C-alpha cells in the first residue's frame, strides 16, 4: 500500500483518485491519499470549485517512485512532483499519517472495478502517448488534442494515440479496396496488431487509457480514439477468439462505470449501433450488449 502526500490544499477543489472523489475546501488540512493499491496504474485528478472547466490530472504508478502533490499559486494548479530523497519522503508520509490528515483509498474488497478498467494499461505505454520524459507520471487535461486531431497545434501537449483511419492507404491494400474497406481484418490483424501494437494487450491498453481520459477529463479526442479502436475490431470478420471475449469484458466495465448523465456525449450512437447490431461481431459482445440495452436503450 502506497501514499501520495499533498503539501497543502490552498484552493477549494474536487480531488479524484481513480473512480473515487472527494470535496476539499480552501485551506482544509488535507495532506494526501494513502493505502493506494500497488500493482496498477492510478490517476489523481482535479476540478477547482471555481472553474468547472478544465478537469486535469496525473497518471502514475507508485512502484516508479515517491510522488506528491503541491499547489502552484503561479500556474494555478495542483502539480504532481517526485521526491528523490526516500528518507525525507517516508518522514513526511509518516508524520501526516500520524496526524491522520490523509484519506484512505476507499477500495471495497469485492470490487475488481479498477483492475478491470486498467487491466492492460501500463505506465510505460502511457508515457509514449503523453511524452514528457523528464517526469515518471503523466499530465492530461480536458483540452489536450490528439495527434490525429492536430493533423486536420502545439506538439508538446498532444496525446500521441495511434492514428486509425479507415479511408487511408494504411487501411486499404491497393487492389483490395472493397474487401479491406468492408472487412478490416487486414488492418486490424496485420497492420495494427502485428505491425504497430505488437500484441492485443498493448492494443487493449491504449483503448482503456483512451476510455479513461474521456471519462475522467471529458477529453474529446480520447473518446474519438476509443470508438475508433472498438469499431476497428467490430468491423473485422476475423478476430482472435480470445480478443473478442476480452473486449466484451473490457467494454462492459467501461459502460458499467460511465456516469449515467454523460452517456450522451461519451457514447457515439453510430459506432455502438453498428458494433452491437450490424458488425461482424454483433453476436460476440453479449455482456456489453446486455448492459447497453438495460442502461442506455435510448441511444440504441
Amino acid at each position: 500500500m502506497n501514499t501520495v502526500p499533498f503539501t497543502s490544499a490552498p484552493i477549494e477543489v474536487t480531488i479524484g483518485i481513480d473512480q473515487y472523489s472527494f470535496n476539499v475546501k480552501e485551506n482544509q488540512p488535507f495532506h494526501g491519499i494513502k493505502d493506494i493499491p500497488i500493482g496498477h496504474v492510478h490517476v489523481i485528478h482535479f476540478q477547482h470549485a471555481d472553474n468547472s472547466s478544465m478537469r486535469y490530472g496525473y497518471w502514475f504508478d507508485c512502484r516508479m517512485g515517491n510522488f506528491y502533490i503541491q499547489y502552484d499559486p503561479k500556474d494555478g494548479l495542483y502539480k504532481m512532483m517526485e521526491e528523490r530523497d526516500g528518507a525525507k519522503f517516508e518522514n513526511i508520509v509518516h508524520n501526516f499519517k500520524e496526524r491522520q490528515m490523509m484519506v484512505s483509498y476507499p477500495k471495497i474488497d469485492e470490487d475488481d472495478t479498477w483492475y478491470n478498467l486498467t487491466e492492460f494499461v501500463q505506465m510505460d505505454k502511457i508515457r509514449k502517448i503523453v511524452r514528457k520524459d523528464e517526469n515518471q507520471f503523466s499530465y492530461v487535461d480536458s483540452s489536450m488534442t490528439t495527434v490525429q486531431e492536430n493533423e486536420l497545434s502545439d506538439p508538446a501537449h498532444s496525446l500521441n494515440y495511434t492514428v486509425i483511419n479507415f479511408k487511408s492507404r494504411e487501411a486499404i491494400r491497393p487492389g483490395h479496396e472493397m474487401e479491406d474497406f468492408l472487412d478490416k481484418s487486414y488492418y486490424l490483424n496485420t497492420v495494427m496488431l502485428q505491425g504497430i501494437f505488437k500484441n492485443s494487450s498493448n492494443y487493449f491498453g491504449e483503448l482503456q487509457f483512451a476510455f479513461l481520459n474521456a471519462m475522467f477529463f471529458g477529453n474529446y479526442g480520447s473518446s474519438l480514439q476509443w470508438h475508433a479502436m472498438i469499431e476497428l475490431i467490430c468491423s473485422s470478420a476475423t478476430v482472435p477468439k480470445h480478443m473478442l471475449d476480452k473486449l466484451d469484458e473490457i467494454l462492459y466495465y467501461q459502460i458499467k462505470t460511465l456516469p449515467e448523465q454523460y452517456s450522451d456525449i461519451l457514447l457515439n450512437e453510430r459506432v455502438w449501433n453498428i458494433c452491437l447490431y450490424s458488425s461482424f461481431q454483433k453476436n460476440s459482445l453479449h455482456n456489453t450488449e446486455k448492459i447497453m440495452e438495460n442502461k442506455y436503450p435510448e441511444l440504441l
Binding site: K167, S168, R169, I172, P174, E177, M178, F181
Partner: protein, 237 residues
C-alpha cells in the same frame, strides 16, 4: 461540399470536373422461375461519367459477365463503378485529370473515396440536385451500344453534339437535363417530340437531331409542357 442550386455555375468554370452516375451500372429484368419463385437476369449496363463543361461523355460499358458468381451485386455495383472511374482518371494525362468528381448518388462517396486514395487532391463531392442521368439509356444510340456489347468496352461521345459551336456550356447542360428530365418523366412522349419530323435527322456522329436554333426553342418548350403536364398528373394538381 455538396453541389446544389446555390453553387450551380461552378459546373461551367475552367476547373475540370466530372459527374458520375451509377444508376444504370447494375440492370436486371425480374421474372418467375418454373417453380414460381422470382429470379433476376442481369442485362448489360453502364457508367455515365461526364464533363459538364465540354460534353465529353465516357460511357464505360458494364458487361453482364462482371456479375458472374458474385454476391450482393447492388453493393458490388458501387465498387465496380469506383474501380472503373479510378482507372479512367489514371488513364488520363495529368493535365486532364478532374479536380472534382461529383457523384449523383451519395452511396458512391465511400467507394470512390477509397478507390481515389492515390489522388488525395481530387475532391469527391455529393450533390443535392436531382439530376436525370438515369434516362441516359433513353438515348437510342447510347442504349444500342450498351446492349450490343459482348465485352467490357469504353465508348466516347460528346453528349452536346455540336451545340457548343453556338451556345454556352450552361445552356448546353440545361438543354441536356431538360431533354433527359423529359425522357425520364414520359419517354414515349419525349421521344415522339424529338423525332416527329422525318426531315430533321441525326448525324451519324451525333445523339440528337440537327435542330436549327428556332426548332430547339420549339422543342424545349414542348419538353417543358410535357414535364408540367406529367407533374399535374402525378399529384392531381
Amino acid at each position: 461540399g455538396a453541389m446544389n442550386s446555390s453553387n450551380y455555375a461552378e459546373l461551367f468554370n475552367n476547373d475540370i470536373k466530372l459527374f458520375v452516375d451509377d444508376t444504370n451500372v447494375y440492370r436486371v429484368t425480374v421474372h418467375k422461375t418454373f417453380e414460381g419463385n422470382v429470379a433476376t437476369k442481369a442485362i448489360n449496363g453502364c457508367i455515365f461519367t461526364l464533363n459538364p463543361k465540354t460534353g465529353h461523355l465516357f460511357l464505360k460499358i458494364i458487361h453482364t459477365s462482371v456479375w458472374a458468381g458474385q454476391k450482393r451485386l447492388s453493393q458490388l455495383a458501387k465498387w465496380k463503378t469506383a474501380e472503373e472511374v479510378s482507372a479512367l482518371v489514371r488513364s488520363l494525362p495529368k493535365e486532364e485529370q478532374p479536380k472534382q468528381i461529383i457523384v449523383t448518388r451519395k452511396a458512391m462517396l465511400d467507394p470512390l473515396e477509397v478507390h481515389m486514395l492515390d489522388f488525395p487532391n481530387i475532391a469527391i463531392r455529393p450533390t443535392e440536385l436531382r439530376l436525370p442521368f438515369s434516362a441516359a439509356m433513353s438515348i437510342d444510340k447510347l442504349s444500342d451500344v450498351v446492349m450490343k456489347a459482348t465485352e467490357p468496352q469504353m465508348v466516347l461521345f460528346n453528349i452536346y453534339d455540336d451545340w457548343l459551336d453556338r451556345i454556352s456550356s450552361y445552356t448546353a447542360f440545361s438543354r441536356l437535363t431538360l431533354l433527359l428530365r423529359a425522357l425520364k418523366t414520359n419517354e414515349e412522349s419525349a421521344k415522339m417530340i424529338l423525332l416527329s419530323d422525318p426531315t430533321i435527322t441525326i448525324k451519324s456522329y451525333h445523339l440528337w437531331p440537327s435542330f436549327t436554333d428556332e426548332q430547339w426553342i420549339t422543342i424545349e418548350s414542348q419538353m417543358r409542357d410535357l414535364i408540367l403536364t406529367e407533374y399535374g398528373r402525378k399529384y392531381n394538381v
